[PDB]
């Protein structure tokens, strides 16, 4: 009498929202948010360094 | 290696009961099925019970009279007769089997009118 | 809306499978348990089992008992790991219930004068919120966003497959004429019976009751129960079927999303100044975690479990230091001279 068992693996299918990523990080960039006043013309900006 | 050795055979009269024993020498009934079989004075072996985890069977020659019952904690099978009649009379063996097939030396059962 | 997730599900039945520890010992129960899953926060539970619950009906289960359906209202059920448990919503063969933490578990019901019970040890384990250990939920608090399963059947990306239901030997069926073996299949379906007592014979009677000579015991044929319909889950107590081993795939109850929780708010500890010095007096009432790092190139982390209340000294420079209570928001602080 013979059986063939059979079995493998998959994702659970509640890691759809909590699931960990991998990444890979280089090149930063600064940003800066500021309140500019200068001969009381002021000002709120967003600039790149 | 395995060894089977039957007990409880012995000699009674028509219409009674025997209880034979048959116990392993290490744990081996979970793995394997045992069957308890008959071999009547110059015929070849035939099967009286088989038992299984999952169930038992019984043959019809001996259904309503014989029942097989396993306990594996004793590391033993016991098979219950009642209502013996001549025609009973053979050399019981408890089989071990499973991967490998191991046979008892037998137990010698009469029954007189 | 409901009715149209609902369909779906009448395309299978309930089936037995073996569950190892019975009442007494190891049977195919009908209420076998395929596999349990708990991921989120509360302890709410979803649970993987072989019977049928709603079936457009409110509150009850529909399973099968050597071949018979029988339908029984949910209300008839317990089960608990070791202390009790609270059903909340079922569907298909999946149950999402409120439980308490336990390395096993165990589901029970009562027939007229059977009990069925199965247990199998799976862990069931708890999975507090926050930086508070706590054991169970608490009352009020602050409110943050948390992971737990879904109390409706909405569906969504998430398919398992089914397959044909299989073919099994039924002893009854199989029995005794006054001189041949008797096969009288249940009028009104095929079936099939393999009997190797003359040559090797396989006969497929259909809705005719068929004595069978040259068999004399009924151990030499087994006769097979057939079912063209009712798609079955891929499982491994029940045996396959022929062709293609598949059929389709259907959606999932009861999934993982997100819902908002409260969470225990741990009391304000006993602060104290010195000279580049700190002292904290610390009571907790349950173990909650303090996380205390420098606020300089350097952190000197320090993670800690505090479960007693305690005494404890630091030190704070010019260049700042931070600290993190429990669920409480994070606190800075700056020295100076005196």
């Known amino acids: 009498n013979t059986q063939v068992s059979k079995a493998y693996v998959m994702k659970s299918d509640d890691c759809l929202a909590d699931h960990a990523e991998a990444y890979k990080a280089h090149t930063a960039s600064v940003q800066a948010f500021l309140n500019i006043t200068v001969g009381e013309h002021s000002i709120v900006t967003t600039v790149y360094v | 290696d395995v060894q089977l050795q039957a007990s409880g055979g012995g000699s009674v009269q028509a219409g009674g009961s025997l209880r034979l024993s048959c116990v392993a020498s290490q744990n081996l009934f979970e793995y394997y099925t045992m069957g308890w079989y008959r071999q009547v004075p110059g015929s070849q072996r035939e099967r009286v019970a088989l038992?299984?985890?999952?169930?038992?069977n019984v043959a019809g020659s001996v259904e309503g009279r014989f029942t097989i019952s396993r306990d594996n904690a004793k590391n033993s099978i016991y098979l219950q007769m009642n209502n013996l009649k001549p025609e009973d009379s053979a050399v019981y063996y408890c089989?071990?089997?499973?991967?490998?097939?191991?046979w008892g030396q037998g137990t010698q059962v009469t029954v007189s009118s | 809306s409901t009715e149209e997730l609902f369909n779906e599900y009448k395309l299978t039945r309930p089936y037995m499978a073996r569950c190892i520890r019975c009442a007494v010992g190891s049977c195919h129960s009908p209420i076998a348990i395929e596999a349990v899953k708990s991921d989120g926060h509360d302890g709410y539970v979803r649970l993987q089992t072989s019977s049928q619950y709603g079936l457009l009906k409110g509150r009850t289960m529909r399973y099968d008992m050597h071949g018979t359906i029988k339908e029984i209202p949910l209300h008839q059920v317990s089960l608990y790991t070791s202390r009790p448990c609270h059903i909340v919503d079922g569907h298909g063969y999946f149950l999402l219930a409120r439980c308490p933490a336990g390395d096993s578990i165990t589901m029970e019901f009562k027939k007229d004068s059977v009990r069925h019970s199965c247990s199998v040890p799976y862990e069931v384990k708890f999975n507090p919120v926050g930086r508070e250990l706590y054991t169970h939920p608490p009352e009020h608090g602050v409110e943050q966003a948390c992971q737990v399963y879904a109390h409706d059947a909405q569906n969504r990306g998430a398919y398992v497959e089914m397959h044909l239901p299989g073919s099994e030997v039924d002893s009854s069926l199989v029995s005794l004429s006054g001189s041949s073996v008797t096969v009288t299949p249940p009028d009104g379906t095929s079936a099939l019976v393999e009997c190797e007592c003359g040559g090797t014979k396989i006969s497929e009677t259909i809705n005719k009751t068929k004595q069978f000579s040259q068999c004399t015991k009924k151990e030499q044929c087994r006769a097979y129960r057939l079912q063209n319909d009712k798609w079955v889950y891929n499982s491994d107590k029940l045996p396959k079927a022929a062709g293609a081993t598949l059929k389709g795939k259907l959606h999932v109850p009861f999934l993982l999303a997100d819902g908002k929780c409260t969470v225990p708010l741990a009391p304000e500890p006993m602060i104290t100044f010195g000279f580049r010095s700190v002292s904290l007096k610390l009571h907790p009432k349950n173990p909650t975690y303090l996380i205390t790092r420098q606020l300089a190139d350097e952190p000197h982390y320090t993670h800690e479990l505090i479960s007693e209340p305690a005494v404890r000294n630091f030190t704070v420079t010019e260049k700042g230091w931070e600290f993190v209570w429990g669920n409480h928001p994070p606190k800075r602080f700056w020295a100076q001279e005196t």
């Open positions: 089989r071990a089997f499973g991967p490998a097939d191991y």
């Open positions: 038992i299984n985890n999952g169930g038992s």
